[PDB]
Design a protein around this ligand. Sequence first.
Ligand code: GA
Length: 307
Amino acid sequence: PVTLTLYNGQHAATGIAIAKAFQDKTGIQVKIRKGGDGQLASQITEEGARSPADVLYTEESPPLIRLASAGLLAKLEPETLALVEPEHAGGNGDWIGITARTRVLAYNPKKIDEKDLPKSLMDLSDPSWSGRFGFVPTSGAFLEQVAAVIKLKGQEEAEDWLTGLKAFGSIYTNNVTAMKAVENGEVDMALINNYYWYTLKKEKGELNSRLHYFGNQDPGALVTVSGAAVLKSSKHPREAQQFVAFMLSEEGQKAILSQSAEYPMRKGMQADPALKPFAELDPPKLTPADLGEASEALSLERDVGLN
Ligand SMILES: [Ga+3]
């Protein structure tokens, strides 16, 4: 008669797949509340001591850093923490990375040749790209992207960059509609996460659009980490710890990968063969702890009037 409540900030099918796999292994039923990362973190905070959430699962790490800093997350069992590299878990061991995703530049080669793509994320503030690219200012990974630019280039250059994006980029409500606009030639390129293209490639088969990886430790080659945590207020602490530990088992990782083209955080495990290998992403040397709560980036987005 035990039901775990999962607050799922990850994409809906991914949360459903891991809940199904967990129930199959253990017989424990999982009830899912799906929302946005920050929305669920805010809801947990306001629900206080009587929150029903047992586990929180997010697409990005700033919400988990926020909640860990606020004192709401339970410490994870040391055997769970040993399943990932230390940079992929919270500094106090109260949240853990589950998969990693990466920033990409999706483009339509009928509208722009690969040879003519911007060399760097930083080039998109230049007037020559006016009208030619989309971005998603309300996206959690875009927040992290702004945080990365601040860390790598400084606040002054990051503000000049984001001003250029406001002047010259086209705003999309989410990564899915931005990807669709590229696929349909409504915009030449867009800044999104990598897994959206693989979802399209499965639904549709033969795509117009292609992915460009900035590589070269460019700010635009940022890798971000989707993570999980047990809530201190959980009435099922053993089962909640079992759930997070199961997410990082080979079976849980495969369950999550069956719905999202992301990189496993379980050490020693490879991704789907269709993915560009993690070793070749050449991402900037930024961890979740470096981006933190992304407070400077939210302050900048608010300053510029984008989110
Ligand atoms: Ga997403």
